[PDB]
Symmetry: D2
Subunit: 121 residues, 4 copies
């Protein structure tokens, strides 16, 4: 019932487009963040992920990686597709944003965490 | 070159194998977890990710999704490949483990967080 | 301007009451969660925290621990008090919920993560 | 068996001293981080927390807030006191570091996450 393919926007105004989900739960897309910590121009960035198919849930868990094109960083998102009380779909996700550090001693400070809620455009 | 390709084990005893990293930073592999939250007999599970290639860092950031084959869950990992003080490679990662819940009202409890350190086998 | 003292509710329906913040940034209160992971019954539970006072910010960062009275668990929250575009106050927080485990080998699964948004009652 | 009172060091070299745990599980102490991202001199900073006393566990969960004296930030830690195979105590903790941001629109980027392991000094 709750399918990742298509166009989504989040609570921060960011957009993503996810393509077809193949029989193995794999998908690809693009991500346009509306926000950045960096002082660079934001670029559309590719994403790759999977959606869990065990017991063929109508509201499956999923995960994807966003490989940013304007920074040395990587973000991963994980969450679940729900059908809220109206029949409306909603992705409830959490993410980790990993920055690059030069030295292994700075590893401790390299990872940020937050949430995003996506709905269809 | 701190390279993701090859065989890795973590501090919990889990194993992963990552294949070739193509010119777009994409890779695939398999994951055998040594631990679970789940009711089930553990199965080798596929993973898909990307390694960031901006400025071609010798210690790049990366992310990957593990699409578990014995549970309704998904885990995402993100981190960075370092060359420690010996010349040994080490992946420092953090993860988010998303469980499935039946009801959107239980979403709050569905996400666990932790770390793992990988070294070569 | 944005003061922790008083009564707050969150997006999950939980309530908290925070007493006076002394000259060291310390405060105490109580927390009544509207949600829990088990069927044991919920009890009002104490909280203890501090609010950062460096540069006496009108929107300071803060942290508090909730010492649950119906579980072996502990939750910590950290966040910042903002004055949104209207003059309304809002606490943006993240939390870590640590469960007890009885073997150190299960430590990996003991920590959950999420967010909460509080506004005044 | 596993008591928070005393002097502890972590895997990054940071030290903390925790005072008596009163009958309500409350404790106070001081934290000297060995690392910082800020361009300031590190200062000893106060901590306030609680240890969970439900069922009087010999290895309880706990939480504490560190009110930093050289930045506008706050850190919270949560974890559990274990007695390792040898009768060694160990604190396994996770933390959230909340930075101050000027604008609520930057909230998303204000929270970092990690772990620490403490042992007695
Ligand atoms: C995951 C969050 N949710 C969104 O929709 N967008 C957010 C990600 C921010 C964009 C990443 C690049 C960046 O700002 C930076 C130092 C990095 C680093 C820096
Ligand atoms: C992320 C951690 N690191 C590992 O090596 N394995 C851990 C995750 C394995 C969980 C298996 C699926 C599951 O429990 C579901 C609920
Ligand atoms: C921070 C969130 N926002 C809010 O407003 N409230 C939320 C916190 C939930 C309240 C914690 C008590 C709890 O869920 C538990 C209550 C009771 C439990 C009993 C056994 C348990 C075993 C293993 C893990 C457990 C985790 C949690 C248990 C529990 C566990
Ligand atoms: C919890 C960890 N384990 C320990 O033993 N000590 C660690 C805590 C570090 C001390 C916090 C002060 C700090 O470095 C910061 C304090 C304040 C900050 C404000 C803005 C920031 C933006 C980007 C990166 C930042 C990094 C660090 C910032 C900071 C940052
Ligand atoms: C998101 O999509 C909407 C509608 O397609 C568009 O108007 C908006 O500008 C997009 N936002 C970003 C950040 O690209
Ligand atoms: C990981 O590989 C090691 C060494 O090859 C092996 O002994 C171990 O059983 C593997 N772990 C799992 C969980 O299969
Ligand atoms: C919090 O306060 C509101 C309004 O006073 C009340 O209706 C609600 O049930 C309270 N929630 C809990 C969990 O006590
Ligand atoms: C921690 O304590 C040890 C032993 O007393 C000391 O040698 C070390 O410098 C301390 N570290 C910090 C950051 O204060």
């Amino acid at each position: 019932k709750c399918s990742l393919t298509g166009k989504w926007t989040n609570d921060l105004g960011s957009n993503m487009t996810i393509g077809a989900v193949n029989s193995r739960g794999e998908f690809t897309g693009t991500y346009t963040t509306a926000v950045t910590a960096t002082s660079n121009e934001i670029k559309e960035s590719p994403l790759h992920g999977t959606q869990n198919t065990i017991n063929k849930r109508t509201q499956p868990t999923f995960g994807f990686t966003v490989n940013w094109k304007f920074s040395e960083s990587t973000t991963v998102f994980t969450g679940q597709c729900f059908i809220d009380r109206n029949g409306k779909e909603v992705l409830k996700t959490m993410w980790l944003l990993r920055s690059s550090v030069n030295d292994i001693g700075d590893d401790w400070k390299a990872t940020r965490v937050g949430i995003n809620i996506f709905t269809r455009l």
